[PDB]
Amino acid sequence: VNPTVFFDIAVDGEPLGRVSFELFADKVPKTAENFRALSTGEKGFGYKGSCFHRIIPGFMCQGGDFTRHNGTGGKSIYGEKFEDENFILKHTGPGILSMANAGPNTNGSQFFICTAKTEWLDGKHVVFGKVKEGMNIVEAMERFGSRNGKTSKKTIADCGQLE
């Protein structure tokens, strides 16, 4: 069965709620495994304690830069940025979980959660999961964003894999 991972989100250190995701390991196993392992921290690094540095209401929440906290860092579990695995899945609406990148074949650890349909990203960003529980928490997060993406308050307080 496809894995499920959770993030416990905090705003300025205060608990907000939990978001869980189904990872589409049946369709993008390499990309799903990267996100899964970064969520459990089992390789010795990952998402716990990192922030969502760019949140644009009506578009997306972006995070996963656990090394520089601003969109310039992050790394995959593969010792280098990795390839676009496939583009089977499309950006169909809110809740889609997709990889951030800076060009072809440059996936690291950064990802975004869509809060709208973003079809112009189809074929350019690898979709690999979707929000299962807590879309309402993603909507709460979105309120702390702004047009230029800066957040009005600061995190993934805990994360891991659910049965």
Side-chain angles (χ1 to χ4, degrees), residues 119-131:
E119 72 283 352
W120 63 88
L121 301 179
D122 289 350
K124 178 187 304 195
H125 295 268
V126 177
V127 174
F128 67 97
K130 70 178 178 159
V131 172

Side-chain angles (χ1 to χ4, degrees), residues 15-27:
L16 179 67
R18 176 171 285 189
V19 183
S20 70
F21 310 93
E22 179 180 349
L23 305 180
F24 300 140
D26 40 8
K27 295 189 197 169

Side-chain angles (χ1 to χ4, degrees), residues 25 31 36 49 55 72 80 96 102 110 112 129 131 139 147 159:
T31 306
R36 189 203 61 80
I55 296 181
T72 65
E80 50 180 356
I96 291 293
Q110 289 186 59
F112 60 100
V131 172
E139 297 161 352
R147 289 288 310 274
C159 51

Side-chain angles (χ1 to χ4, degrees), residues 43-80:
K43 307 301 190 176
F45 51 88
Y47 296 136
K48 184 175 178 186
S50 67
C51 81
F52 277 82
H53 66 276
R54 185 170 198 246
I55 296 181
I56 299 171
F59 180 22
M60 60 85 227
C61 300
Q62 178 167 334
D65 182 355
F66 61 84
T67 66
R68 303 187 55 71
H69 329 291
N70 67 3
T72 65
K75 61 181 182 179
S76 84
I77 64 168
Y78 306 113
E80 50 180 356

Side-chain angles (χ1 to χ4, degrees), residues 70-139:
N70 67 3
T72 65
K75 61 181 182 179
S76 84
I77 64 168
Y78 306 113
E80 50 180 356
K81 299 284 228 290
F82 63 103
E83 70 274 17
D84 296 314
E85 186 167 15
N86 61 62
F87 298 107
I88 291 168
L89 299 176
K90 304 307 181 186
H91 297 83
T92 52
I96 291 293
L97 178 66
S98 184
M99 292 302 281
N101 67 48
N105 305 305
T106 61
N107 296 286
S109 57
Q110 289 186 59
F111 61 87
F112 60 100
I113 308 168
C114 295
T115 57
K117 174 174 173 225
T118 59
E119 72 283 352
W120 63 88
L121 301 179
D122 289 350
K124 178 187 304 195
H125 295 268
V126 177
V127 174
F128 67 97
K130 70 178 178 159
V131 172
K132 191 183 209 218
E133 303 175 302
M135 188 66 210
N136 61 308
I137 299 304
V138 177
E139 297 161 352

Side-chain angles (χ1 to χ4, degrees), residues 6-10 17-19 155-159:
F6 75 89
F7 292 171
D8 282 345
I9 303 294
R18 176 171 285 189
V19 183
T155 57
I156 301 177
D158 197 14
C159 51

